Amino acid sequence: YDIQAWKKQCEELLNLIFQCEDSEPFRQPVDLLEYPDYRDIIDTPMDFATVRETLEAGNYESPMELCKDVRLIFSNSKAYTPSKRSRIYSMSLRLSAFFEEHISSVLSDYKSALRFHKR
Numbered sequence: 001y002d003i004q005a006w007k008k009q010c011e012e013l014l015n016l017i018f019q020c021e022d023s024e025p026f027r028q029p030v031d032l033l034e035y036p037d038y039r040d041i042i043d044t045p046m047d048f049a050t051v052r053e054t055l056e057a058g059n060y061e062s063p064m065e066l067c068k069d070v071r072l073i074f075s076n077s078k079a080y081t082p083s084k085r086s087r088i089y090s091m092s093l094r095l096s097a098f099f100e101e102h103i104s105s106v107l108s109d110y111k112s113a114l115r116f117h118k119r
């Protein structure tokens with residue numbers, strides 16, 4: 001029932017993601033010199049360093065907000081990919097499964113703790 005526990009749990013999950021080779025294309029903002037049409041397809045770029053910095057700045061109020069930004073990294077990869085068999089998109093799918101598998105309990109514990117607070 002710790003309402004604040006999600007933050008360190010998300011920090012640790014981000015550390016695991018950064019160690020994962022599958023996160024390499026997503027660690028920093030997509031290089032617009034390497035992909036000049038990126039902003040023609042993608043309205044809101046997102047990457048893991050931006051997620052970590054937002055968390056560390058105290059700019060997420062809940063793990064659901066962090067989850068929305070991480071999911072945006074994956075949906076941007078899906079929208080930008082020229083193929084569902086592309087290398088970078090395939091890395092995003094594996095990383096998304098890993099993230100969803102690990103974020104589930106963080107969200108559940110947070111929601112449980114908030115419900116206990118409001119009881």
Ligand SMILES: O=C(O)c1scc2c1OCCO2
Pocket residue numbers: 025030035076077078080081082083086087088089
């Ligand atoms: O070049 C590709 O196949 C892909 S698939 C997703 C991407 C990307 O390149 C830039 C980052 O997002």
